[PDB]
Structure 1
């Protein structure tokens, strides 16, 4: 295929918040109620130690009499979110040793903004990218966005390959979820339903460069080679997982069924992934535990579910646990943060069998329910 990730960059925002950040804001704006009690309790059962945020509980946006409107949310997405995407993209470009003029496409995603021009326009502008740049801003897909953007970039790379053209694609995910805290609080208080969104999600931008190899001076270094991918939708599961537009932003839909449906989808999707490319793999990469696993940490039960279904230890998904515990679920931006972390020396120390694996399965689930899986070779 000639497809390789030649750079990765991750930018988390300045603030790191413990579980009491939610308690502070809840107390400030709502009297205690049964549903709030339940959710405040759940906020402490996730296994997330700290979450990344563009701000703290005293930020003016979330301290109005009302939750901020979707317009007010957009304003902060641009002032505090966009800067993170530019820095993540610069880092990925620096690692890949590419200059702005060499970027041929950009595939971006977010589920926590709506805008025309889209946020990718402003990022490309700050990076000084070409006025001829081909851009894709994906919408509709939430947490599976990082891998869906990577898969989309792969297809686009191969389109240029078919024409004998160099392709260097900036693949970007930016999520700013923590600003919707007051919206979720209002829904919990007024509707008295146990909405677990406030407990899970955080802010982040992450980027990789995907190259089709054409035009590279030979023997050029890469971090991962992209070998293959699979994608599926789980039937009759639209009502289980979603993010509905609202004058207050977007409202989380997240049912108890989600981690059950996700776990059941793992084994047959992995089978299809592996069968499409097994003849490219060595004898030491045959069963799920032989690989390192870059799982999107959608929640604690996704990780324990995956360990259970595939027969893995936590250390097989060490970088996933690392991001989840220390940063929380940053939706589409999390997966590239995981792949970035996985190749660092202190994750190497924790490799199952004392063997850092040459092959990595990536996996993510999102609204649909959409399942995304990919196979990487780590150089």
Structure 2
């Protein structure tokens, strides 16, 4: 009946010398001769609908300007020196809005696809935040772009695990991604292979975090931003070779087929229907069809956004925070998700879907490698 799940805090931290413009990889393309496959990447780059890409540094950064592309190990160092502190910060903010002190946190569910370490990057955030030594941690791998909502769903079950025993649960949900440092890697592949490869044109850096509470022993008033009502997750069969992030001495090589937008669009109607199938009577009749909702969509391609607005019959305004993030920060893989949710609850209320009706019910949506599809139903609290 009542799950008692709520996001009680959200925080985002994009790196500062962000906004690597458009002249960006046009400029770093100074490590390769002119070639017609390269030219095409530069061309497509101009109509991704992205204006600025948030990044841990500028096209001048040392790591990006070695005679060679940085090795996977050189990536790990900058992931730590520049990536982690975004993660620490995003968490402080989230914990501040949730009015929680380090000691109250029970689990941590983190994700990333742009690092590999033992101990994982999560250990280090926890360390600096001073979380308990008795904390329960989960670092998700293998999922890339769908990572935010996966971590959220896993946080949910986990919270509920503690609800079973009667224990308060405050799960820090962490996403950190640093992809822009892999520009040189992607530039070599475009040069050597002569395939176009649109990966460099889309990905960016960010960290974001939410606190998920199971409501047991919650601070008086029990004040949350979103309640978490339900979630649906699924894997599209025989679609491994369409989308992926293969390990490499230079980090990870992007895999993307012509089929991805179609499979991504086609998934929405059945997945949506299953989200609502398991939620009837719980929501009012004014929230039945996709347009009755606000849509926290993970962007990661203009084509994916417009794909949705056609398939589900939405306006761009329904995904107003999705566009806002995409245009001004790029596709920050698993970390864009919460970055959208936090943005949605601000001043976006104006550019909003209909005449001017802010929707009480919000559907989170996302996909990534494997082609996993993730979707969740949220209830925004009207102040």
- Band the TM-score falls in, shorter-chain normalisation: over 0.9
1:236 aligns with 2:238: yes
2:195 alignment partner, SS class: coil
Give yes or no for contact 1:319–1:347 (8 Å, CA) kept in 2: no
1:16-47 per-position Cα deviation (integer Å, ceiling 9, x unaligned): 33543434444321111011001111111100
What is the deviation of 1:351? 3.8
2:218 alignment partner, SS class: coil
Give yes or no for contact 1:24–1:57 (8 Å, CA) kept in 2: no
1:325-352 per-position Cα deviation (integer Å, ceiling 9, x unaligned): 0000000000000000000023444342
1:196-254 per-position Cα deviation (integer Å, ceiling 9, x unaligned): 10000000000000000001144221000000000010111000000011000000001
| 1: CA distance, partners of 2:297 / 2:158 | 24
What is the deviation of 1:366? 0.3
Q: How does 1:1-379 map to 2 (within 5 A)?
A: 1-379=3-381
2:296 alignment partner, SS class: strand
| 1: CA distance, partners of 2:332 / 2:25 | 20
Give yes or no for contact 1:21–1:56 (8 Å, CA) kept in 2: no
What is the deviation of 1:255? 1.1
What are structure 2's unaligned runs of at least 5 residues?
none
Change (3 A) 1:158 1:348: farther
Change (3 A) 1:349 1:196: closer
What are structure 1's unaligned runs of at least 5 residues?
none
| 2: CA distance, partners of 1:84 / 1:23 | 24
What is the deviation of 1:135? 0.1
Aligned Cα RMSD in Å? 1.0
Give yes or no for contact 1:319–1:338 (8 Å, CA) kept in 2: yes
1:357 alignment partner, SS class: coil
2:331 alignment partner, SS class: coil
What is the deviation of 1:125? 0.3
Change (3 A) 1:48 1:254: same
Moved more, 351-360 or 312-321: 351-360
* Residue-pair matches, total: 379
What is the deviation of 1:278? 2.2
Give yes or no for contact 1:341–1:347 (8 Å, CA) kept in 2: no
| 2: CA distance, partners of 1:17 / 1:215 | 42
| 1: CA distance, partners of 2:102 / 2:218 | 16
What is the deviation of 1:71? 0.3
1:278 alignment partner, SS class: coil
| 1: CA distance, partners of 2:155 / 2:312 | 28
Moved more, 210-219 or 287-296: 210-219
